[PDB]
Amino acid sequence: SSQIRQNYSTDVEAAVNSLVNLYLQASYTYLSLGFYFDRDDVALEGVSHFFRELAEEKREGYERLLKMQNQRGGRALFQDIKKPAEDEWGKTPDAMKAAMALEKKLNQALLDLHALGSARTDPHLCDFLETHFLDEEVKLIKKMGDHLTNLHRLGGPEAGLGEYLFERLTLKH
């Protein structure tokens, strides 16, 4: 019986906790991707930095969701965080594809949450998602798409050379 709770569905509260777990798992996957590219037998600093930055971005994501949960009077409930799907992530193209699939999953979860909020007529939740999540995802997915396109353009018999050039000329280091 939270003293501040108003127009906040128990369904949305539960969905927010689920989304928090999804972001914790996503941040975890990027942590893994980040250090994989830091291995001496992979060594692509720009790629490592790219994923480590995304791990931080997802952390800000669940921290923002957690803050909002408390602002609305909801109660945070944490569950085990599932380990990443892979121990090794292949080459840059393979890793970027995995990252892309992860973002699409996150984006669908955000869209599902927004639809749920809309169904429960919760304009504050809608505004929150639109302001801090929806466009951020679209921009990120667009960026990954651009990266995949350039990596594919740099593929072929000399993909190794291409992978090196991409990390050196497109990614920050």
Q: Enumerate residues 96-135 that contact its own copies by CB under 8 A.
A: 100, 104, 107-108, 111, 114-115, 118, 121, 123-124, 126-131, 134-135
* Beta carbons within 8 Å of 105's beta carbon, 6+ residues apart: 22
The interface with its own copies within residues 14-33 (CB under 8 A) comprises: 24, 28, 31-32
| Helix, coil or strand: residue 157 | coil
Pick the closer one to its own copies by CB: 11 or 82.
82
Planar angle of CA 36, 164, 104, nearest 5 degrees: 55
60 is in an annotated binding site: yes
Distance of CA 153 to the CA centre of its chain: 25
Would you count residue 42 as binding its own copies (CB under 8 A)?
A: yes
Pick the closer one to its own copies by CB: 18 or 107.
107
Q: How many residues bind its own copies (CB under 8 A)?
A: 81
C-alpha distance across the termini of the chain, in Å: 51
Contact present, 122 and 9 (Cβ < 8 Å): yes
Only one residue has tokens 């019986």, namely 1
Would you count residue 171 as binding its own copies (CB under 8 A)?
A: no
163 is in an annotated binding site: no
Q: Report the interhelical angle of 159-169 vs 92-119 (nearest 10°).
A: 60
Q: CB of 134: closest distance to its own copies in angstroms?
A: 5
* Near its own copies by CB under 8 A: residue from 98, 161, 171, 172: 161
Task: Provide the annotated binding site for Fe cation.
Answer: 53, 56-57, 60, 63
